Write an enzyme that holds these catalytic residues in place. Sequence first.
Site, PDB file in Angstrom:
ATOM      1  N   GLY B 123       0.813  -1.219   0.000  1.00 31.53           N
ATOM      2  CA  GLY B 123       0.000   0.000   0.000  1.00 31.53           C
ATOM      3  C   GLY B 123       0.842   1.263   0.000  1.00 31.53           C
ATOM      4  N   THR B 143      -8.413  -8.869  -2.122  1.00 26.84           N
ATOM      5  CA  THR B 143      -9.510  -9.261  -1.261  1.00 26.84           C
ATOM      6  C   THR B 143     -10.681  -8.362  -1.625  1.00 26.84           C
ATOM      7  N   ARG B 245     -42.670 -29.793 -24.663  1.00 25.80           N
ATOM      8  CA  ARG B 245     -44.106 -29.527 -24.562  1.00 25.80           C
ATOM      9  C   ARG B 245     -44.487 -28.163 -25.159  1.00 25.80           C
ATOM     10  N   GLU B 282     -42.537 -13.618  -4.496  1.00 22.09           N
ATOM     11  CA  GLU B 282     -43.046 -14.942  -4.846  1.00 22.09           C
ATOM     12  C   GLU B 282     -43.088 -15.880  -3.642  1.00 22.09           C
ATOM     13  N   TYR B 330     -48.357 -23.971  -5.726  1.00 27.97           N
ATOM     14  CA  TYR B 330     -47.401 -24.371  -4.686  1.00 27.97           C
ATOM     15  C   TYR B 330     -47.815 -23.842  -3.342  1.00 27.97           C
ATOM     16  N   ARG B 411     -38.213 -31.116 -10.229  1.00 34.02           N
ATOM     17  CA  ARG B 411     -38.418 -32.053 -11.339  1.00 34.02           C
ATOM     18  C   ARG B 411     -37.972 -31.498 -12.686  1.00 34.02           C
ATOM     19  N   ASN B 422     -34.475 -20.106  -8.226  1.00 31.94           N
ATOM     20  CA  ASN B 422     -34.846 -21.151  -7.278  1.00 31.94           C
ATOM     21  C   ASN B 422     -33.814 -21.349  -6.175  1.00 31.94           C
TER      22      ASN B 422
HETATM   23  N1  LIG Z   1      -7.214  -1.951   2.142  1.00 30.67           N
HETATM   24  C1  LIG Z   1      -5.944  -2.068   1.759  1.00 30.67           C
HETATM   25  O1  LIG Z   1      -5.579  -3.017   1.085  1.00 30.67           O
HETATM   26  C2  LIG Z   1      -4.956  -1.007   2.162  1.00 30.67           C
HETATM   27  C3  LIG Z   1      -5.412   0.269   2.474  1.00 30.67           C
HETATM   28  N2  LIG Z   1      -4.581   1.257   2.836  1.00 30.67           N
HETATM   29  C4  LIG Z   1      -5.180   2.559   3.148  1.00 30.67           C
HETATM   30  O2  LIG Z   1      -4.686   3.606   2.305  1.00 30.67           O
HETATM   31  C5  LIG Z   1      -4.402   4.779   3.076  1.00 30.67           C
HETATM   32  C6  LIG Z   1      -2.914   5.075   2.986  1.00 30.67           C
HETATM   33  O3  LIG Z   1      -2.561   5.023   1.610  1.00 30.67           O
HETATM   34  P1  LIG Z   1      -2.338   6.392   0.805  1.00 30.67           P
HETATM   35  O4  LIG Z   1      -3.273   7.442   1.361  1.00 30.67           O
HETATM   36  O5  LIG Z   1      -2.346   6.092  -0.674  1.00 30.67           O
HETATM   37  O6  LIG Z   1      -0.839   6.766   1.261  1.00 30.67           O
HETATM   38  P2  LIG Z   1       0.432   5.824   0.941  1.00 30.67           P
HETATM   39  O7  LIG Z   1       0.422   4.645   1.883  1.00 30.67           O
HETATM   40  O8  LIG Z   1       0.503   5.600  -0.551  1.00 30.67           O
HETATM   41  O9  LIG Z   1       1.654   6.777   1.374  1.00 30.67           O
HETATM   42  C7  LIG Z   1       1.723   8.118   0.889  1.00 30.67           C
HETATM   43  C8  LIG Z   1       3.144   8.633   1.058  1.00 30.67           C
HETATM   44  O10 LIG Z   1       4.081   7.652   0.597  1.00 30.67           O
HETATM   45  C9  LIG Z   1       5.056   8.243  -0.272  1.00 30.67           C
HETATM   46  N3  LIG Z   1       4.887   7.746  -1.676  1.00 30.67           N
HETATM   47  C10 LIG Z   1       4.011   6.789  -2.043  1.00 30.67           C
HETATM   48  N4  LIG Z   1       4.081   6.517  -3.371  1.00 30.67           N
HETATM   49  C11 LIG Z   1       5.034   7.307  -3.893  1.00 30.67           C
HETATM   50  C12 LIG Z   1       5.614   7.523  -5.244  1.00 30.67           C
HETATM   51  N5  LIG Z   1       5.172   6.816  -6.315  1.00 30.67           N
HETATM   52  N6  LIG Z   1       6.597   8.447  -5.369  1.00 30.67           N
HETATM   53  C13 LIG Z   1       7.043   9.152  -4.308  1.00 30.67           C
HETATM   54  N7  LIG Z   1       6.561   9.005  -3.055  1.00 30.67           N
HETATM   55  C14 LIG Z   1       5.570   8.113  -2.776  1.00 30.67           C
HETATM   56  C15 LIG Z   1       4.887   9.735  -0.082  1.00 30.67           C
HETATM   57  O11 LIG Z   1       5.649  10.035   1.086  1.00 30.67           O
HETATM   58  P3  LIG Z   1       6.447  11.413   1.324  1.00 30.67           P
HETATM   59  O12 LIG Z   1       5.392  12.489   1.243  1.00 30.67           O
HETATM   60  O13 LIG Z   1       7.037  11.252   2.704  1.00 30.67           O
HETATM   61  O14 LIG Z   1       7.469  11.446   0.215  1.00 30.67           O
HETATM   62  C16 LIG Z   1       3.419   9.890   0.250  1.00 30.67           C
HETATM   63  O15 LIG Z   1       3.159  11.078   1.006  1.00 30.67           O
HETATM   64  C17 LIG Z   1      -4.812   4.497   4.508  1.00 30.67           C
HETATM   65  O16 LIG Z   1      -6.098   5.079   4.736  1.00 30.67           O
HETATM   66  C18 LIG Z   1      -4.886   2.984   4.581  1.00 30.67           C
HETATM   67  O17 LIG Z   1      -5.909   2.526   5.469  1.00 30.67           O
HETATM   68  C19 LIG Z   1      -3.254   1.062   2.918  1.00 30.67           C
HETATM   69  C20 LIG Z   1      -2.675  -0.172   2.629  1.00 30.67           C
HETATM   70  C21 LIG Z   1      -3.477  -1.323   2.224  1.00 30.67           C
HETATM   71  C1  LIG Z   2     -37.904 -19.903 -11.223  1.00 27.93           C
HETATM   72  C2  LIG Z   2     -38.982 -19.232 -11.107  1.00 27.93           C
HETATM   73  C3  LIG Z   2     -40.221 -18.472 -10.865  1.00 27.93           C
HETATM   74  N1  LIG Z   2     -40.743 -17.954 -12.120  1.00 27.93           N
HETATM   75  C4  LIG Z   2     -42.053 -18.394 -12.567  1.00 27.93           C
HETATM   76  C5  LIG Z   2     -41.862 -19.108 -13.876  1.00 27.93           C
HETATM   77  C6  LIG Z   2     -42.967 -19.527 -14.614  1.00 27.93           C
HETATM   78  C7  LIG Z   2     -42.814 -20.192 -15.830  1.00 27.93           C
HETATM   79  C8  LIG Z   2     -41.534 -20.438 -16.310  1.00 27.93           C
HETATM   80  N2  LIG Z   2     -41.320 -21.070 -17.468  1.00 27.93           N
HETATM   81  C9  LIG Z   2     -40.076 -21.301 -17.924  1.00 27.93           C
HETATM   82  N3  LIG Z   2     -39.921 -21.947 -19.104  1.00 27.93           N
HETATM   83  N4  LIG Z   2     -38.962 -20.917 -17.248  1.00 27.93           N
HETATM   84  C10 LIG Z   2     -39.027 -20.271 -16.066  1.00 27.93           C
HETATM   85  O1  LIG Z   2     -37.993 -19.922 -15.456  1.00 27.93           O
HETATM   86  C11 LIG Z   2     -40.371 -19.988 -15.519  1.00 27.93           C
HETATM   87  C12 LIG Z   2     -40.564 -19.331 -14.317  1.00 27.93           C
HETATM   88  C13 LIG Z   2     -40.026 -17.030 -12.898  1.00 27.93           C
HETATM   89  C14 LIG Z   2     -40.418 -16.787 -14.210  1.00 27.93           C
HETATM   90  C15 LIG Z   2     -39.727 -15.864 -14.987  1.00 27.93           C
HETATM   91  C16 LIG Z   2     -38.638 -15.179 -14.460  1.00 27.93           C
HETATM   92  C17 LIG Z   2     -37.905 -14.183 -15.312  1.00 27.93           C
HETATM   93  O2  LIG Z   2     -38.486 -13.696 -16.267  1.00 27.93           O
HETATM   94  N5  LIG Z   2     -36.653 -13.846 -15.014  1.00 27.93           N
HETATM   95  C18 LIG Z   2     -36.334 -12.761 -14.103  1.00 27.93           C
HETATM   96  C19 LIG Z   2     -34.820 -12.598 -13.992  1.00 27.93           C
HETATM   97  C20 LIG Z   2     -34.272 -13.430 -12.838  1.00 27.93           C
HETATM   98  C21 LIG Z   2     -32.865 -13.878 -13.153  1.00 27.93           C
HETATM   99  O3  LIG Z   2     -32.131 -13.102 -13.803  1.00 27.93           O
HETATM  100  O4  LIG Z   2     -32.489 -15.005 -12.758  1.00 27.93           O
HETATM  101  C22 LIG Z   2     -36.952 -11.456 -14.520  1.00 27.93           C
HETATM  102  O5  LIG Z   2     -36.210 -10.459 -14.660  1.00 27.93           O
HETATM  103  O6  LIG Z   2     -38.189 -11.414 -14.704  1.00 27.93           O
HETATM  104  C23 LIG Z   2     -38.245 -15.418 -13.146  1.00 27.93           C
HETATM  105  C24 LIG Z   2     -38.939 -16.340 -12.367  1.00 27.93           C
HETATM  106  C1  LIG Z   3      -9.641  -1.558  13.657  1.00 33.52           C
HETATM  107  O1  LIG Z   3      -8.586  -2.499  13.918  1.00 33.52           O
HETATM  108  C2  LIG Z   3      -7.549  -2.683  13.038  1.00 33.52           C
HETATM  109  N1  LIG Z   3      -7.665  -2.291  11.740  1.00 33.52           N
HETATM  110  C3  LIG Z   3      -6.655  -2.468  10.875  1.00 33.52           C
HETATM  111  C4  LIG Z   3      -5.475  -3.063  11.320  1.00 33.52           C
HETATM  112  C5  LIG Z   3      -4.388  -3.278  10.477  1.00 33.52           C
HETATM  113  C6  LIG Z   3      -3.254  -3.874  11.029  1.00 33.52           C
HETATM  114  C7  LIG Z   3      -2.125  -4.122  10.255  1.00 33.52           C
HETATM  115  C8  LIG Z   3      -2.135  -3.771   8.912  1.00 33.52           C
HETATM  116  C9  LIG Z   3      -3.253  -3.165   8.343  1.00 33.52           C
HETATM  117  N2  LIG Z   3      -3.197  -2.822   6.981  1.00 33.52           N
HETATM  118  C10 LIG Z   3      -4.314  -2.192   6.310  1.00 33.52           C
HETATM  119  C11 LIG Z   3      -4.914  -3.353   5.527  1.00 33.52           C
HETATM  120  N3  LIG Z   3      -3.867  -4.058   4.782  1.00 33.52           N
HETATM  121  C12 LIG Z   3      -4.308  -5.035   3.873  1.00 33.52           C
HETATM  122  C13 LIG Z   3      -5.340  -5.894   4.248  1.00 33.52           C
HETATM  123  N4  LIG Z   3      -5.781  -6.831   3.400  1.00 33.52           N
HETATM  124  C14 LIG Z   3      -5.229  -6.956   2.173  1.00 33.52           C
HETATM  125  N5  LIG Z   3      -5.685  -7.913   1.330  1.00 33.52           N
HETATM  126  N6  LIG Z   3      -4.224  -6.140   1.781  1.00 33.52           N
HETATM  127  C15 LIG Z   3      -3.752  -5.179   2.604  1.00 33.52           C
HETATM  128  N7  LIG Z   3      -2.743  -4.391   2.153  1.00 33.52           N
HETATM  129  C16 LIG Z   3      -2.419  -3.828   4.914  1.00 33.52           C
HETATM  130  C17 LIG Z   3      -2.004  -3.095   6.191  1.00 33.52           C
HETATM  131  C18 LIG Z   3      -4.390  -2.915   9.126  1.00 33.52           C
HETATM  132  C19 LIG Z   3      -5.387  -3.460  12.660  1.00 33.52           C
HETATM  133  N8  LIG Z   3      -6.414  -3.265  13.495  1.00 33.52           N
END
Ligand SMILES: NC(=O)C1=CN([C@@H]2O[C@H](COP(=O)(O)OP(=O)(O)OC[C@H]3O[C@@H](n4cnc5c(N)ncnc54)[C@H](OP(=O)(O)O)[C@@H]3O)[C@@H](O)[C@H]2O)C=CC1
Ligand SMILES: C#CCN(Cc1ccc2[nH]c(N)nc(=O)c2c1)c1ccc(C(=O)N[C@@H](CCC(=O)O)C(=O)O)cc1
Ligand SMILES: COc1ncc(-c2cccc(N3CCN(c4cnc(N)nc4N)CC3)c2)cn1
Lengths: 511, 511
Positions: B123, B143, B245, B282, B330, B411, B422
């Site tokens: 990050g 994720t 049918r 339904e 049904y 069926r 369903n």
């Molecule tokens: N959900 C997830 O997977 C993750 C989420 N996060 C979230 O993101 C946020 C933090 O990320 P973000 O706000 O983007 O900040 P960053 O973690 O990207 O860090 C920003 C700082 O890093 C330095 N930096 C990063 N990229 C560069 C680059 N290409 N060139 C030069 N310097 C760079 C700069 O530091 P300087 O100014 O000192 O030069 C900048 O101020 C948090 O809110 C955190 O929760 C973070 C990690 C994982």
């Molecule tokens: C199963 C069942 C119940 N039913 C009743 C019902 C009655 C006769 C049927 N006859 C046939 N041939 N196929 C069916 O699926 C069907 C379904 C349904 C019928 C149509 C739709 C339909 O037109 N599709 C939805 C989209 C839902 C999806 O994307 O999966 C819509 O937008 O209207 C949904 C449910």
């Molecule tokens: C509110 O409690 C809390 N909330 C947050 C933390 C936590 C602790 C360590 C690290 C971090 N990261 C923020 C989330 N990250 C991440 C998570 N998943 C994926 N797939 N990629 C990531 N890059 C990386 C780093 C978050 C602890 N405690």
Amino acid sequence: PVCLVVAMTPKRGIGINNGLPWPHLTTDFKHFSRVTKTTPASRFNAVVMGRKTWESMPRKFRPLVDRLNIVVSSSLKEEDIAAEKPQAEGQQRVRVCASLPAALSLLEEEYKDSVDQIFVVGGAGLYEAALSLGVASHLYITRVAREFPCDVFFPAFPGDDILSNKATYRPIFISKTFSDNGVPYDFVVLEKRRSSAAAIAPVLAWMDEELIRAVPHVHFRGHEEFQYLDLIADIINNGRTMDDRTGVGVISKFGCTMRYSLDQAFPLLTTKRVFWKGVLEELLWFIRGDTNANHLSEKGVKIWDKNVTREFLDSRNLPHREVGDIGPGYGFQWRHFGAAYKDMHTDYTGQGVDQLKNVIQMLRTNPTDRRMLMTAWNPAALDEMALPPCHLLCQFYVNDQKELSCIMYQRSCDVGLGVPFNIASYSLLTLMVAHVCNLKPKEFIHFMGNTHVYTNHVEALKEQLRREPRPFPIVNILNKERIKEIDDFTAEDFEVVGYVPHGRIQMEMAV
Amino acid sequence: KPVCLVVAMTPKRGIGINNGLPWPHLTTDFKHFSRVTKTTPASRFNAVVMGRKTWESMPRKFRPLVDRLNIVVSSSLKEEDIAAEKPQAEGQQRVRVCASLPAALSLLEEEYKDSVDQIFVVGGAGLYEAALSLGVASHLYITRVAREFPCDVFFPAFPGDDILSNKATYRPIFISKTFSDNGVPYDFVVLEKRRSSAAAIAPVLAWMDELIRAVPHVHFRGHEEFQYLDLIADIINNGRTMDDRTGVGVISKFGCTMRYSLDQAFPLLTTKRVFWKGVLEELLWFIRGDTNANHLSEKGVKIWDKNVTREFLDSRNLPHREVGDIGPGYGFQWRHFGAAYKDMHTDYTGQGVDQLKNVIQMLRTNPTDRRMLMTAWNPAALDEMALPPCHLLCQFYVNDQKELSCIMYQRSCDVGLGVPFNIASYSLLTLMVAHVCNLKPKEFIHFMGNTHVYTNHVEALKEQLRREPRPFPIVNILNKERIKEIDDFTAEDFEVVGYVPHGRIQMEMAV
Ligand SMILES: NC(=O)C1=CN([C@@H]2O[C@H](COP(=O)(O)OP(=O)(O)OC[C@H]3O[C@@H](n4cnc5c(N)ncnc54)[C@H](OP(=O)(O)O)[C@@H]3O)[C@@H](O)[C@H]2O)C=CC1
Ligand SMILES: C#CCN(Cc1ccc2[nH]c(N)nc(=O)c2c1)c1ccc(C(=O)N[C@@H](CCC(=O)O)C(=O)O)cc1
Ligand SMILES: COc1ncc(-c2cccc(N3CCN(c4cnc(N)nc4N)CC3)c2)cn1
Ligand SMILES: NC(=O)C1=CN([C@@H]2O[C@H](COP(=O)(O)OP(=O)(O)OC[C@H]3O[C@@H](n4cnc5c(N)ncnc54)[C@H](OP(=O)(O)O)[C@@H]3O)[C@@H](O)[C@H]2O)C=CC1
Ligand SMILES: C#CCN(Cc1ccc2[nH]c(N)nc(=O)c2c1)c1ccc(C(=O)N[C@@H](CCC(=O)O)C(=O)O)cc1
Ligand SMILES: COc1ncc(-c2cccc(N3CCN(c4cnc(N)nc4N)CC3)c2)cn1
Ligand SMILES: O=c1ccn([C@H]2C[C@H](O)[C@@H](COP(=O)(O)O)O2)c(=O)[nH]1
Ligand SMILES: O=c1ccn([C@H]2C[C@H](O)[C@@H](COP(=O)(O)O)O2)c(=O)[nH]1
């Protein structure tokens, strides 16, 4: 290191009158042809055979193309075989050796760079000699399920329990059951035992962060019974310990699926003898829409007695039921859905909805219809039944090729006891229905709800899982012409062919 | 030389707010992050690289990140700004400060080769923007947080950000199932830059061994929606073409299963937008036991209208049925199984079997009972119905830990249009029942009979399969205290949180 390749009856019979004891087994020959030929570039295989085996072959097929033909013989000469037919260009000339130890020596001398795998093809002379010297690393065995008259036999060996009931040979491969000319068989092999993805990995490693198997050795598990076995093992490994209506503890899993082919053979499970007389007599009972369990009990089929006793009918809050009455049960809902039940003696003809007759008439006139269903679940008369249906619903299906499949849904499953009975029972129904409608049987699919093994059965089931399955049997409908409608079947109209199960396992019915 | 990026992300690409994380604490995410940054194949460790604000946003006990070489990019912060911040533990690696990311990667080669195994940009927006510009990013560990939060700092736009929301390339090689912490759904994706021991078993595997795949790149298929996508793909590839049918060409298959978890998120499928207003209206229609389709029609759900028209009612041979009357549909059997139907206006309270009442009662009292089933199928009443029920049966199952699982058998399954509806429609019932019985929802199991895609969707489905699924949403039940019975529920008592589906595909309804 040599390999043996054989086709074999349960009693180890292999030949008669210097010929095969069975009608031609096309899938066995294709399997033979493939095993003896295939190779992972510069090397051909070798087929070592006896004189009697060489002679028994048709002239057309000898020498076996693309393979070094070696015949073990004293009386035959190398030129009599050469004078038998002109040699086609591109093949090694057939070689003759004194005995089998001398036969392999020939490969050590002259063919050391050319040959890949070595196959002994027959007969009892060379097979016996091969097992004597113990140079056999593997056995490719085609187990013919049917017994046939034989005069030449394959020698018995440690771990021949895979054929029939009684240095070692353990199975490592069991195929699904095939059939030709009304002869069931399957293929086994036995062993002489005595950063594109590096990135993905750590995500999987943390992702887990969290005992019993069916026939561990067997690594390729083509046999369809493996479903049922792995299903037992799974509930024993991953199920949940539960209480019950019955009072006996249960280990249960929810949502379970099995499917079995019907085209080749019949899924009459082999790991324990299945009471087929039961599944037959009970199904015919169902079809009749009979609700009298005495008609079953008298025939030697005692499966329902405990659930129709004087004692049970009173606990089930029905003191006015006669002993033997199952209420408006499985068969009654099939043949007379919704009808007013009185007793097992009352005639319910024409009353209610005959689901079975309508399922057939639909199959016979319009097979694509999606409303071909037969239910036994009637919320209106659940209390009047001595015991609610387990197997409560079944649907039928036809494809292009006029092949018939059947789904069955079961709410509650006693895996040890009821399940193999249930598989065989409905698979039989599919065969019956298929015939009446003029359709091929294709597949039976088993849908399960509460899928459980009883705790008292658990010791016996580990015993069952040590047993590797035998090839499935064939069930034949007899008097095919005489039977035209579903009610025309009788007990004598069926034939179970080549059913060679493991010995009986005793399991108590949960009252 | 190559680097990996590991981020968590809002659908609008949001990563931060107020120099902190936008969402409540996600434990499973922080677990993932910890393991991915740390795990290493001997003498070797991983480098983590972050911006100055990422270092600051991080709690004091966690910085520097243990067992990982920390590098902070900054020009205000110096190397002794960090050393004085916390005493360095013995054994760990010192934090290094570089003025830009190129300097960071240079330092890694200049001093830290033979030392550091893998390099992770951690990050924030600045360094993610920098790393994408250089083209040093081999893999993106995203994720996907499914819920939209207040954010002031965002992950930069990149080719392949169609995995986040609607619109040298980054394609998914990994998509996990949906997790959830603190009412927040999310999942893990990995992206990729593109622009005779056992060999004796293999010869029998040769002959036994033998077109459309969805999101084929995705090698790991955690996401439970993959079940449905592959189900479409299988039907097309391996199905049989039947007439229907209705007359329209059909590719169909028999007996296929799906199961979806309900403990983490809701299987409201993401690969195309599901009409949730319909699934809710339904179901509450069914729950009321309503048979009047105009109540749905007036509410903006016209899913039943094409089946209650004067033309279709008469083609189903029901001349006296008013427009809207599904007959004993049904809803009707669920609450009044076996009740004698008149019209949609007649009041049926008390008549027939109230299966739903019996289900909930048996659940709240005797959860180890196996007769906990509900059925819409009534053979005696099929004729009076405008349509024979597609979903005709559901079974409920209660676990050790008061966990509810539900099986539903269908069926006939319109895999294009009806199936996701369903899935959604019964998963919702399972949520509703679970709350009403005081139970944790665990799993929905879909059992399917005639499982088919229509041929006027084949083109419209091949397109859908190109779309990889988004994380599942969470459906929360609002006003929990007020709702204690199943009838207590209203359309307002629900809230779909974090739903981000792909574009709508026009699929006509077959009458
Ligand atoms: N959900 C997830 O997977 C993750 C989420 N996060 C979230 O993101 C946020 C933090 O990320 P973000 O706000 O983007 O900040 P960053 O973690 O990207 O860090 C920003 C700082 O890093 C330095 N930096 C990063 N990229 C560069 C680059 N290409 N060139 C030069 N310097 C760079 C700069 O530091 P300087 O100014 O000192 O030069 C900048 O101020 C948090 O809110 C955190 O929760 C973070 C990690 C994982
Ligand atoms: C199963 C069942 C119940 N039913 C009743 C019902 C009655 C006769 C049927 N006859 C046939 N041939 N196929 C069916 O699926 C069907 C379904 C349904 C019928 C149509 C739709 C339909 O037109 N599709 C939805 C989209 C839902 C999806 O994307 O999966 C819509 O937008 O209207 C949904 C449910
Ligand atoms: C509110 O409690 C809390 N909330 C947050 C933390 C936590 C602790 C360590 C690290 C971090 N990261 C923020 C989330 N990250 C991440 C998570 N998943 C994926 N797939 N990629 C990531 N890059 C990386 C780093 C978050 C602890 N405690
Ligand atoms: N089920 C299956 O998989 C197969 C079955 N078969 C069946 O087997 C039968 C033929 O086999 P089988 O009757 O046992 O006869 P064999 O095939 O064993 O051949 C017998 C002759 O070959 C010579 N021979 C065989 N083994 C040796 C040895 N170890 N040392 C020296 N000479 C040997 C002997 O000649 P000599 O008397 O001069 O010493 C003997 O007379 C047929 O009925 C055929 O249908 C055949 C192939 C496959
Ligand atoms: C399923 C079903 C129909 N039924 C009816 C029925 C009724 C209540 C039940 N209750 C329980 N707990 N388990 C059951 O298997 C069972 C079966 C059966 C009843 C008993 C046996 C039985 O005692 N076992 C046979 C072996 C048959 C087999 O190989 O499966 C025996 O040897 O007696 C079989 C089937
Ligand atoms: C019914 O007509 C027929 N019936 C038979 C033949 C035939 C023709 C060439 C050869 C043979 N065998 C050669 C070897 N065999 C074998 C078959 N399977 C296994 N697994 N192992 C075997 N060792 C059977 C015997 C048989 C021709 N025609
Ligand atoms: O065909 C059958 C009939 C009975 N049972 C078993 C399963 C149940 O444990 C018991 C029936 O009791 P409940 O499911 O009704 O409790 O019998 C089967 O498995 N298959
Ligand atoms: O809840 C529903 C309602 C309808 N359908 C679809 C499946 C079938 O394609 C069609 C019904 O046609 P029949 O099976 O009745 O012929 O409607 C469903 O999948 N689910």
